[PDB]
Design an enzyme around this catalytic site. Structure first.
Site, PDB file in Angstrom:
ATOM      1  N   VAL B  13       0.863  -1.211   0.000  1.00 36.84           N
ATOM      2  CA  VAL B  13       0.000   0.000   0.000  1.00 36.84           C
ATOM      3  C   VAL B  13       0.884   1.241   0.000  1.00 36.84           C
ATOM      4  O   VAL B  13       0.350   2.358   0.018  1.00 36.84           O
ATOM      5  CB  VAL B  13      -1.009  -0.015   1.161  1.00 36.84           C
ATOM      6  N   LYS B  15       5.236   2.525  -1.208  1.00 35.79           N
ATOM      7  CA  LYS B  15       6.663   2.293  -1.538  1.00 35.79           C
ATOM      8  C   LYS B  15       7.303   3.670  -1.568  1.00 35.79           C
ATOM      9  O   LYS B  15       6.628   4.627  -1.999  1.00 35.79           O
ATOM     10  CB  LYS B  15       6.835   1.516  -2.847  1.00 35.79           C
ATOM     11  N   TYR B  18      11.741   5.337   2.234  1.00 36.65           N
ATOM     12  CA  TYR B  18      11.640   4.721   3.591  1.00 36.65           C
ATOM     13  C   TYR B  18      11.602   3.185   3.522  1.00 36.65           C
ATOM     14  O   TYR B  18      11.816   2.533   4.585  1.00 36.65           O
ATOM     15  CB  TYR B  18      10.376   5.186   4.325  1.00 36.65           C
ATOM     16  N   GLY B  19      11.335   2.594   2.354  1.00 39.24           N
ATOM     17  CA  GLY B  19      11.009   1.174   2.204  1.00 39.24           C
ATOM     18  C   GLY B  19       9.606   0.962   1.673  1.00 39.24           C
ATOM     19  O   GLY B  19       9.249   1.571   0.644  1.00 39.24           O
ATOM     20  N   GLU B  20       8.828   0.101   2.313  1.00 39.05           N
ATOM     21  CA  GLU B  20       7.483  -0.298   1.829  1.00 39.05           C
ATOM     22  C   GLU B  20       6.530  -0.412   3.004  1.00 39.05           C
ATOM     23  O   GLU B  20       6.999  -0.781   4.107  1.00 39.05           O
ATOM     24  CB  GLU B  20       7.526  -1.648   1.118  1.00 39.05           C
ATOM     25  N   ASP B 133       7.969  15.494  11.892  1.00 36.59           N
ATOM     26  CA  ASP B 133       7.645  15.327  10.458  1.00 36.59           C
ATOM     27  C   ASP B 133       6.127  15.289  10.270  1.00 36.59           C
ATOM     28  O   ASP B 133       5.632  14.434   9.567  1.00 36.59           O
ATOM     29  CB  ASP B 133       8.394  14.134   9.864  1.00 36.59           C
TER      30      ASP B 133
HETATM   31  C1  LU8 Z   1       2.441   7.113   7.382  1.00 34.52           C
HETATM   32  O1  LU8 Z   1       3.151   6.049   8.054  1.00 34.52           O
HETATM   33  C2  LU8 Z   1       2.600   4.781   8.100  1.00 34.52           C
HETATM   34  C3  LU8 Z   1       1.362   4.433   7.599  1.00 34.52           C
HETATM   35  C4  LU8 Z   1       0.889   3.140   7.750  1.00 34.52           C
HETATM   36  C5  LU8 Z   1      -0.470   2.750   7.200  1.00 34.52           C
HETATM   37  C6  LU8 Z   1      -1.386   2.261   8.067  1.00 34.52           C
HETATM   38  N1  LU8 Z   1      -2.644   1.915   7.681  1.00 34.52           N
HETATM   39  C7  LU8 Z   1      -2.943   2.053   6.378  1.00 34.52           C
HETATM   40  C8  LU8 Z   1      -2.072   2.614   5.426  1.00 34.52           C
HETATM   41  C9  LU8 Z   1      -2.584   2.743   3.964  1.00 34.52           C
HETATM   42  C10 LU8 Z   1      -3.445   1.712   3.545  1.00 34.52           C
HETATM   43  C11 LU8 Z   1      -3.995   1.792   2.243  1.00 34.52           C
HETATM   44  C12 LU8 Z   1      -3.638   2.836   1.420  1.00 34.52           C
HETATM   45  C13 LU8 Z   1      -4.210   2.947   0.024  1.00 34.52           C
HETATM   46  C14 LU8 Z   1      -4.195   1.653  -0.778  1.00 34.52           C
HETATM   47  C15 LU8 Z   1      -5.405   1.496  -1.736  1.00 34.52           C
HETATM   48  N2  LU8 Z   1      -6.124   2.746  -2.131  1.00 34.52           N
HETATM   49  C16 LU8 Z   1      -5.572   3.336  -3.374  1.00 34.52           C
HETATM   50  C17 LU8 Z   1      -6.282   3.813  -1.113  1.00 34.52           C
HETATM   51  C18 LU8 Z   1      -5.654   3.401   0.212  1.00 34.52           C
HETATM   52  C19 LU8 Z   1      -2.810   3.859   1.806  1.00 34.52           C
HETATM   53  C20 LU8 Z   1      -2.261   3.833   3.135  1.00 34.52           C
HETATM   54  C21 LU8 Z   1      -0.781   2.915   5.827  1.00 34.52           C
HETATM   55  C22 LU8 Z   1       0.248   3.398   4.862  1.00 34.52           C
HETATM   56  C23 LU8 Z   1       1.655   2.233   8.435  1.00 34.52           C
HETATM   57  C24 LU8 Z   1       2.930   2.582   8.926  1.00 34.52           C
HETATM   58  O2  LU8 Z   1       3.756   1.664   9.573  1.00 34.52           O
HETATM   59  C25 LU8 Z   1       3.325   0.314   9.712  1.00 34.52           C
HETATM   60  C26 LU8 Z   1       3.394   3.849   8.741  1.00 34.52           C
HETATM   61  O3  LU8 Z   1       4.628   4.195   9.253  1.00 34.52           O
HETATM   62  C27 LU8 Z   1       4.687   4.462  10.628  1.00 34.52           C
END
Ligand code: LU8
Ligand code: LU8
Ligand code: LU8
Ligand code: LU8
Lengths: 292, 283
Positions: B13, B15, B18-20, B133
């Site tokens: 979800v 990239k 920072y990684g993925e 940040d």
């Molecule tokens: C900012 O930082 C961090 C964030 C997260 C995190 C936690 N829940 C959900 C998300 C996510 C899920 C789904 C989508 C998209 C995919 C499909 N569609 C197109 C709309 C939705 C975007 C984002 C994330 C990225 C986890 C982290 O660490 C485990 C993070 O780092 C601390």
């Protein structure tokens, strides 16, 4: 295949608990840290992040985890398992011949020199809690050094990744004079290597007592068993090491055996009150490699 | 006892440098798994050290589950596991979605609540924490309409911040680095920019602005440190407040609030606790 099964508790103390477990069909050791020791868990995790730390005479890392739901946290370290247990355990009932005694002590020297010497990578590392309970015996008759929770790191191309403000860590029985009298130079990496050398001398003494010569061997005793109470305080140890200038006695039967005569000389060169007079880990390793 | 540690990584979800980030499954339950690049290893250590010091638990802070370090042949693998928010980041959400008064206020009050909880020292409790940040990509949207603050990889207890969100005292290097309150005030500046990003997407009188990032009209797509210093410090520019906001009582009050997060003088800016109080008296 990340799952682990905890099978039996092989140790419980102020540090937490260690379990023999099964993972990918192999024995593993699983340490679950006490709340009291949470900073050790994090320090040991920082140390095991070094890929070039890996060595036959250092306890091998598999994983580290901090887990939480709601208000409680668990802290896990998973390592390779050594069914023979610690050197402390092993020495209790086993006696040694010349070959087995030198194999054990050279292996510890090899592990300690590997920690102390920077690789250009792996920083230089001082252990700060070397003792026979923190050394594990392997089926090949070599040992490995365990417990990097108090370790300090140094890089010659930059500077020094040092202690908590608390300098009274390490196991009291094995603390160097400069730790017990609190005069240790806390901003000097070499100070921490020199504390390890003091403790190594005490481990050499513990091992050599168990090597048979001329049909004689000593019973297992911990360092300073004869001069401090059973469960010595910091001040008990300061009294004997700093005030009374006591060092472990060399049994006179050692002087009939060339190996034990050499080891007595080596352990005395670990025990100078002047930290800079003590041998280096590399010099100890070179000396033990030459002894027969 | 069995310790089930298997996590199934189902879809990527995110990239980045920072990684993925992966949606994953543990024991039938969604989790989010951040797999750190070598570039960003220190963020894993900093966040892990913070959670080892204080187990933060707050509805507007992304919920910690685990920090995992696994030995590989010639590398260390570092994972942070958190709760999963299927709606994704505030940045994502605002691209397509417009807001009404209730939704807009619920979003910004929830962010202020999370931020005040980080900033405050609680005795008996938690140390004060500055985020360093704060931005719309580091805020997640929950199904209940509230948000949670994410990514404590640069957080400090008592990598640089994202340049577009840096306060003037960071860009001109006058920040009082030996004063913890300095770092709270840098977060407040960034909070004001997030509040501008959200307010633009609130409909009034049939009017809404398109999503844009802060300073979109005065810096390049990928601005340099110098680009930002010239705008924020030398010319002292601030984000535009559209005329249409002054017809709407909520957007009029939010404009006043964001101005009080953007003073050049860091000590003049509102505190997170004062922003909360102000927001509870809007509408
Ligand atoms: C900012 O930082 C961090 C964030 C997260 C995190 C936690 N829940 C959900 C998300 C996510 C899920 C789904 C989508 C998209 C995919 C499909 N569609 C197109 C709309 C939705 C975007 C984002 C994330 C990225 C986890 C982290 O660490 C485990 C993070 O780092 C601390
Ligand atoms: C890391 O995360 C998750 C963990 C768990 C989980 C699994 N086994 C056991 C536990 C547990 C049990 C009991 C105690 C306490 C009870 C009171 N006192 C006696 C001290 C001990 C703590 C912990 C948990 C919390 C479940 C989760 O979700 C359902 C987790 O979230 C993904
Ligand atoms: C020192 O420190 C750590 C050690 C270990 C570890 C690894 N292999 C084997 C062991 C062991 C097994 C069995 C016994 C026997 C001895 C006597 N008998 C009467 C009961 C039990 C002792 C020791 C241990 C304790 C793991 C650690 O972390 C996972 C350690 O911490 C870094
Ligand atoms: C190591 O690693 C991971 C572990 C887990 C996990 C899985 N099952 C059970 C547990 C658990 C929690 C708590 C207790 C005990 C502690 C002492 N006792 C008095 C009370 C309760 C036992 C077991 C955990 C922590 C999940 C993971 O991922 C989500 C892990 O990997 C990061």
């Amino acid at each position: 295949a990340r799952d682990i099964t905890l099978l039996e508790c092989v140790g419980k103390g102020r540090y937490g608990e260690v379990w023999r477990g099964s993972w990918q069909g192999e024995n593993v050791a699983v340490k679950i840290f006490s709340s009291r020791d949470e900073k050790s868990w994090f320090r040991e995790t920082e140390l095991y992040n070094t890929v070039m730390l890996r060595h036959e005479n250092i306890l091998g890392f598999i994983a580290s985890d901090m887990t939480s739901r709601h208000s409680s946290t668990q802290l896990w370290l998973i390592t390779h398992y050594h069914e023979m247990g610690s050197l402390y355990d092993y020495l209790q009932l086993t006696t040694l011949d010349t070959v087995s005694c030198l194999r054990i002590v050279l292996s510890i020297a090899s592990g300690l020199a590997h920690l102390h010497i920077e690789i250009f990578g792996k920083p230089a590392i001082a252990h700060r809690d070397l003792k026979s309970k923190n050394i594990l015996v392997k089926k090949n008759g070599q040992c490995c050094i365990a417990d990097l929770g108090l370790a300090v790191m140094h890089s010659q191309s930059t500077n020094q990744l040092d202690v908590g403000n608390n300098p009274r860590v390490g196991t009291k029985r094995y603390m160097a004079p400069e730790v017990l009298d609190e005069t240790i130079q806390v901003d000097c990496f070499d100070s921490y290597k020199r504390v390890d050398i003091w403790a190594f001398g005490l481990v050499l003494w513990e091992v050599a007592r168990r090597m048979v010569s001329n049909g004689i061997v000593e019973d297992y005793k911990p360092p300073f068993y004869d001069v401090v109470p059973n469960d010595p305080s910091f001040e008990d140890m300061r009294k004997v090491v700093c005030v009374d200038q006591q060092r472990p006695n060399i049994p006179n039967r050692w002087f009939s055996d060339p190996t034990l005569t050499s080891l007595a000389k080596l352990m005395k060169e670990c025990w100078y009150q002047n930290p800079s007079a003590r041998l280096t880990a590399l010099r100890i390793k070179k000396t033990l490699t030459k002894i027969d």
